[PDB]
């Protein structure tokens, strides 16, 4: 793909409806641990182990300890230059009658923290719960989410499992349910929410410019979105630290940390 920031800016000047697809690179640039890279472990596990239906059916306490840790660490994490440029872009363009939507695979809500309003969280959120009995989804920001998790979740190898009985894990407060809650996070092997996918498809069908930022383009179906925008003729620009399997499918590729190249692109 082309490397010309000058040509990208010419499309941006005239774009009325911009889709920005963001991946784990945006989050890593805030120091958010995602436990996906080689070497990135919580105790003896990675996300490929614990962000799974298997892990929750086998040891829901361990899964909750992992997500509790991840919730607690967010107190120390802030949006980075890429989040801020993306949020400011949406605000500035919205005054002009131009739409910016963020479709994120990240679950840490840093886009919302930076001020993004038009946000589709395709893999859910660390700060939502889903009831495994009634299916109700709820926002939840309480530290700790339940009393038994107080002080739990430490990441050091050799830390003992909390082995919290299921009744002391987070429970549904819907009158008459009390089922076991799980994080409202899409796990590996699970289907994304069709309603969210419908909203994604609407934005992809109407946008006139698409950016793919900070993602390896190896997790599906997300890695397919920006490929299908290119089919209607719409330009796609990739901002990532390295080429990906999907790089050659795009009009532009800008190498570098997201927080370095995005502010220039969206100014």
């Amino acid at each position: 793909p082309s490397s010309s920031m000058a040509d990208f800016r010419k499309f941006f000047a005239k774009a009325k409806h911009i889709v920005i697809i963001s991946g784990a690179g945006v989050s890593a640039e805030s120091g958010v641990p995602t436990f996906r890279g080689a070497g990135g472990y919580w105790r003896k596990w990675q996300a490929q182990d614990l962000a799974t239906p298997l892990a929750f059916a086998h040891n829901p306490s361990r899964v909750w300890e992992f997500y509790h840790y991840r919730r607690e660490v967010m107190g120390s994490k802030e949006p980075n230059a890429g989040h801020r440029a993306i949020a400011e872009c949406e605000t500035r363009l919205g005054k002009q009658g131009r739409r910016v939507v963020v479709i994120t695979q990240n679950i840490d809500e840093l886009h919302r923290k930076a001020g993004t309003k038009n946000l589709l969280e395709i893999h859910g959120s660390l700060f939502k719960t889903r009831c495994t009995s009634c299916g109700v989804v709820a926002e939840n920001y309480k530290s700790p989410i339940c009393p038994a998790l107080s002080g739990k979740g430490a990441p050091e190898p050799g830390t003992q499992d909390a082995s919290i009985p299921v009744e002391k894990l987070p429970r549904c407060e819907e009158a008459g349910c009390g089922g076991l809650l799980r994080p409202h996070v899409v796990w590996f092997g699970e289907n994304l929410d069709p309603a969210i996918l419908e909203e994604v498809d609407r934005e992809l069908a109407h946008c006139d410019l698409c950016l793919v930022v900070g993602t390896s383009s190896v997790v599906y179906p997300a890695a397919m979105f920006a490929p299908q925008v290119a089919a209607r003729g719409v330009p796609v620009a990739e901002f990532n630290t390295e080429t990906t399997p999907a790089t050659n499918r795009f009009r532009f590729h800008f190498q570098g940390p997201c927080g370095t190249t995005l502010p220039e692109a969206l100014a």
Binding site: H123, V186, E190, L192, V218, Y220, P221, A223, M224
Partner: peptide, 4 residues
């Protein structure tokens, strides 16, 4: 479609 499912998450890879």
């Amino acid at each position: 479609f499912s998450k890879q």
